[PDB]
């Protein structure tokens, strides 16, 4: 009735906005409007099915030590790495993964709470992660963190060397159905560049790739599409004295208002999300999966009629 009109008079005034501002800083090159509600989940129930060992701290901290990431061991890189490690493994709310080379394993979660796209609640998202490839050792294995929070997401690792991991996201109604959340928009962010360690090298790289949507550059931002449909900053988006425009700790947070410089938006094109997280020398990498997109006057598609104790956690960690 008339709720609805006034939204859909906002949301088209919006689009207008949006459209006269498409060049201007922060905002969507091509305007669009928010149909996904998907950005925060505190009370998400995490669950992986038995085939997958989900490691223990210490058992993980044995095995991680067994192939040379260790605080003992007189390689920097290597101790350095065992410390970045050793922060993220410590941490009780996250169930600790060993990758092996394509074999993919299924986080579930479910009992969400607050999600929803286009006025359908959305009560199941599975996350299914296929370690691609790595520089450690024979490349075969990496370890990763799944949060209890799906809009949280994940940590992996790259022992400073690189890594490559696809993840395949699949989001279900009350029922337990596929939906296809065709032209959602996903928050691809803090996709830092030149942000590495100074011992080791100072331009490492984190980046999406082989994305099965559409990107929807951010203007200004740092964040550039590339062959195989990749995501990622060209040089530094770190430190002024190397060209970026804000260093690091001025943008790369979920609150700032210049955290569109290190971000992307996706536009969900299919039923089965497909993108690949991909790092080289961070040592350990956060990418949230959620729709907390950092594009400014993106307005939210209105329905017709018929904070976060993970996000800090994973913050201060950073
Ligand atoms: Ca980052």
Same mark, same amino acid.
């Given at each position: =009735?008339?709720?609805?009109?006034?939204?859909?008079?906002?949301?088209? +005034?919006?689009?207008?906005?949006?459209?006269?501002?498409?060049?201007?800083?922060?905002?969507?090159?091509?305007?669009?409007?928010?149909?996904?509600?998907?950005?925060?989940?505190?009370? +998400?129930?995490?669950?992986? *099915?038995?085939?997958?060992?989900?490691?223990?701290?210490?058992?993980?901290?044995?095995?991680?030590?067994?192939?040379?990431?260790?605080?003992?061991?007189?390689?920097?890189?290597?101790?350095?790495?065992?410390?970045?490690?050793?922060?993220?493994?410590?941490?009780?709310?996250?169930?600790?993964?060993?990758?092996?080379? *394509?074999?993919? !394993?299924?986080?579930?979660?479910?009992? &969400?709470?607050?999600?929803?796209? @286009?006025?359908?609640?959305?009560?199941?998202?599975?996350?299914?992660?296929? &370690?691609?490839?790595?520089?450690?050792?024979?490349?075969?294995? #990496?370890? #990763?963190?799944?949060? /209890?929070?799906?809009?949280?997401?994940?940590?992996?690792? *790259?022992?400073?060397?690189?890594?490559?991991?696809?993840?395949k996201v699949k989001?279900? *109604?009350?029922?337990?159905?596929? #939906?296809?959340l065709?032209?959602?928009?996903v @928050?691809?962010?803090?996709?830092?560049? =030149?942000?590495?360690? =100074?011992?080791?090298?100072?331009?490492?790289?984190?980046? !999406?790739?082989?994305?099965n949507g559409?990107?929807?550059?951010?203007?200004?931002?740092?964040?550039?599409?590339?062959? @195989?449909? /990749?995501?990622?900053?060209?040089?530094?988006?770190?430190?002024?004295?190397?060209? +970026?425009?804000?260093?690091?700790?001025?943008?790369?947070?979920?609150?700032?208002?210049?955290?569109?410089?290190?971000?992307? !938006?996706?536009?969900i094109?299919q039923?089965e999300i497909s993108f690949? #997280?991909?790092?080289?020398?961070?040592? @350990?990498?956060?990418?949230?999966?959620?729709?907390?997109?950092?594009?400014?006057?993106?307005?939210?598609?209105? !329905?017709?009629?018929?904070?976060?104790?993970?996000?800090?956690?994973? +913050?201060?960690?950073?």
């Amino acid at each position: =009735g008339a709720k609805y009109k006034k939204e859909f008079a906002a949301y088209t +005034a919006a689009l207008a906005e949006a459209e006269s501002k498409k060049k201007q800083d922060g905002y969507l090159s091509e305007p669009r409007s928010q149909s996904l509600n998907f950005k925060s989940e505190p009370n +998400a129930i995490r669950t992986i *099915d038995s085939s997958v060992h989900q490691y223990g701290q210490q058992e993980l901290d044995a095995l991680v030590k067994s192939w040379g990431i260790s605080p003992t061991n007189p390689d920097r890189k290597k101790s350095t790495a065992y410390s970045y490690f050793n922060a993220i493994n410590s941490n009780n709310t996250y169930a600790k993964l060993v990758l092996e080379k *394509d074999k993919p !394993v299924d986080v579930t979660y479910t009992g &969400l709470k607050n999600s929803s796209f @286009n006025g359908k609640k959305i009560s199941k998202v599975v996350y299914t992660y296929t &370690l691609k490839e790595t520089g450690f050792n024979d490349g075969t294995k #990496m370890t #990763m963190f799944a949060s /209890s929070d799906p809009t949280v997401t994940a940590w992996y690792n *790259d022992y400073f060397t690189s890594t490559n991991i696809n993840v395949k996201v699949k989001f279900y *109604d009350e029922e337990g159905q596929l #939906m296809n959340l065709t032209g959602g928009l996903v @928050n691809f962010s803090s996709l830092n560049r =030149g942000n590495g360690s =100074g011992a080791i090298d100072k331009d490492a790289i984190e980046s !999406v790739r082989n994305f099965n949507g559409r990107y929807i550059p951010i203007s200004g931002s740092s964040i550039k599409i590339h062959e @195989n449909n /990749s995501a990622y900053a060209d040089s530094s988006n770190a430190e002024k004295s190397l060209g +970026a425009r804000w260093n690091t700790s001025e943008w790369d947070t979920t609150s700032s208002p210049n955290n569109w410089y290190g971000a992307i !938006v996706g536009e969900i094109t299919q039923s089965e999300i497909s993108f690949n #997280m991909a790092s080289s020398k961070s040592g @350990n990498i956060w990418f949230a999966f959620n729709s907390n997109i950092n594009a400014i006057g993106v307005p939210t598609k209105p !329905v017709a009629p018929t904070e976060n104790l993970y996000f800090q956690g994973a +913050a201060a960690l950073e």
